[PDB]
Amino acid sequence: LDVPSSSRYDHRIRYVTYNPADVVQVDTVLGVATHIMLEEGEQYLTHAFGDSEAYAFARKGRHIFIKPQAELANTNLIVVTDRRSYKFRLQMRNDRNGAMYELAFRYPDTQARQTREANARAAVEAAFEQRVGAYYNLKYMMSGDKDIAPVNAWDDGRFTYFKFSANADLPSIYFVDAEGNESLVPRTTVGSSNNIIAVHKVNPKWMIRLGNRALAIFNEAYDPNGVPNDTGTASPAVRRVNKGGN
Amino acid sequence: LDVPSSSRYDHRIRYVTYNPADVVQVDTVLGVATHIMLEEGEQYLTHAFGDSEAYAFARKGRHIFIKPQAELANTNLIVVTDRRSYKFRLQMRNDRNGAMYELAFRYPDTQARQTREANARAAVEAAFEQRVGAYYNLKYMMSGDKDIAPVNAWDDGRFTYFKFSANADLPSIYFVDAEGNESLVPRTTVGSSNNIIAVHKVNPKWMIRLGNRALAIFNEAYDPNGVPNDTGTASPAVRRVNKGGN
């Protein structure tokens, strides 16, 4: 039977630590309005009194107002929401002293959940950025309209990164087959200043165009073997699991 | 008679295991409303009191709310649901002590049935993956545009597989007749990294096509006899049964 902890400024405002296995005692004096604040995003279902005529009930959303309107009111409340169900043990105060104006709940369960999943993205982001155990190949030739040349090009065995100077206009890249036929390849843009364009394929050829200017890129050490994407993520450290179930 | 055991924090919150061979004892006092929680997703049909007037029953979803309105509230509750029916012995307590603020069920039946189904599915999956009594043929041959050829090819006597280097595009595979015509064949992609393509016929000849480039795969040890598929599924250790009867 948790008694809510008094606010340091005034005992008339009380905080209590929520628990699905305990019932909180509510002290109500004659003629005051008892304020219940629900945590954000609780969808109210319904409640129940020990005496519907003993206490006055008004609710809109996450705010519940309780007020005794009949003498000698010793009943209880069971309020249910989509997430949880709060339980109270109401004792009518006989001396109009030790009044409690408002009750607020602390939810250690939500904190425990969110802190855990916060650590979840912590691990995910760390694994993504760490990218250790990856090799880089730099052997790349070039020919054509040199003015739109990428300042550097390299591949990580999965992608291929092209970079350009801050004054260089970002060109387009087209994936070249063995026969000389150009076809699209999905490009993603990364890098500090959007000076890195990454294409989602490794190919023994590439071609770069802009306006009526062209350029070819050769992979002098195209490794057809590569490393299988054993996890379906750009990293070898991010497992990809099927959430949907069913 | 099952009597629920209270929670360690409050004697009002009691937990109990459902059983169809006995009826829950509920010890209600005057001035309390009892919260009853059905199993998640359970579908209530109807209920029955000894006295419809003795207790009020308000229900929304899976939540049951009761409270005695008359003295000597000594009757029964028989609520029926789609999956089961719950039974209660509402006994009035004249001392207004030892309340029942709630009652939550720990179902053995649903998890007990779940474990069996999970066990059956596990046995099924183990039967598929174990894959014993399999002979393998590797005498495969190619000719043509080698640039998109598979790294490996083999048959288990039933299916023909092709493994492709993780950097290479996945090509389209066609069936070849003894005459020289081409026919679509169903393909399923298996393997850890989706680098193994499986076609559903063991055949002397195969053509692989992509873009403008083609490659013909030749089997040098096509065995017409094969293995009979008498169990109706890819495994020799799984049957297929006609459950529909009729």
């Binding site: 005529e53 003498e71 009111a73 | 309105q69």
Partner: peptide, 15 residues
């Protein structure tokens, strides 16, 4: 009609 009885009957008839 002692007030405790008032409380009891109001409790009973209430929903």
């Amino acid at each position: 009609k002692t007030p405790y009885e008032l409380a009891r009957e109001r409790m009973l008839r209430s929903g």
